[PDB]
Amino acid sequence: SETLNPSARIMTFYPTMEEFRNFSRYIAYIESQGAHRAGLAKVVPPKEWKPRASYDDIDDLVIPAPIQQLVTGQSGLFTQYNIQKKAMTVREFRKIANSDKYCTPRYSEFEELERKYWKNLTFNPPIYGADVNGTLYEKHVDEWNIGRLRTILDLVEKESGITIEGVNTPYLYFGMWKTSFAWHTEDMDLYSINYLHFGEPKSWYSVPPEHGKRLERLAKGFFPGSAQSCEAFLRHKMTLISPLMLKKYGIPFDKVTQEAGEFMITFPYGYHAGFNHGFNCAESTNFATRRWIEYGKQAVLCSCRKDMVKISMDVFVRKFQPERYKLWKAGKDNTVIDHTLPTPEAAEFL
Ligand SMILES: O=c1[nH]cnc2cnccc12
Ligand SMILES: [Zn+2]
């Protein structure tokens, strides 16, 4: 496991239509390749696959709570205050996105736009049409349908009947230039899938899960007051740390640009942050494999109740780890997670 992807670099995959039909099996395959080590992987779907005929019929879709993204800070360290604005349509949002005030600046290469984002992120706050409940997939699409992934995370809805927005349901993100997401891991340290439906690119930064604690120690040192108030303040999704800051403090990280028509997979305990190049739309949700159960059992949650997502691990432990159930309920489960190990389902490829 330590031999595959030794630098824990972001990997890209090009499945065929046959390989694209079994979602869970393909995630097992990419892990057998060492993809998970980076904490982020890109999946380019087969040319024949399309989740919708066109996007010219969504102008009247309402973004109920758009957020103005105010950033405070300096020297590569920032706090993001996401201000709720009144509801707007996709057409109203696209008009603001493409206006002279908010449009993407003229640039040659990504590195120019990236330098531009870190120089100007505290000025002219943009509007992010983020966390919109909904899907852009046509009803008949069976392959990589974010609405219905059919992973083991489905036990939460199957056994209890409870739905957690964006976690076991899809979220839509309407972006504009300079909109962004703060460093974070998923709720319960779950996996996530992100499909960029259309528009301008979305740039990502990732820290390998095996270096995740180094990012946490850096954050705690910089924000001691926040660290004193909450056990996992990064779950508030307010902390921005520049790649230059990470480089200076020796935090290993990688960066990738996602283009329209591509999927991004985040792995358990894979910290990620990023920004939108301009007007776009992405669909997202969380999912699980057998490997996540131990991450969910060990996840450190927000203790100040600013973040409320908590999944009971009991059903997963009883069903997939019965030999460990009594030891775990007694608080005697001393399992140490090896972040390099692929999911057990990967066995057929190894
Ligand atoms: O594209 C994103 N927008 C907002 N939040 C996110 C969280 N994780 C991944 C991607 C995004
Ligand atoms: Zn995320």
Ligand SMILES: [Zn+2]
């Ligand atoms: Zn908290």
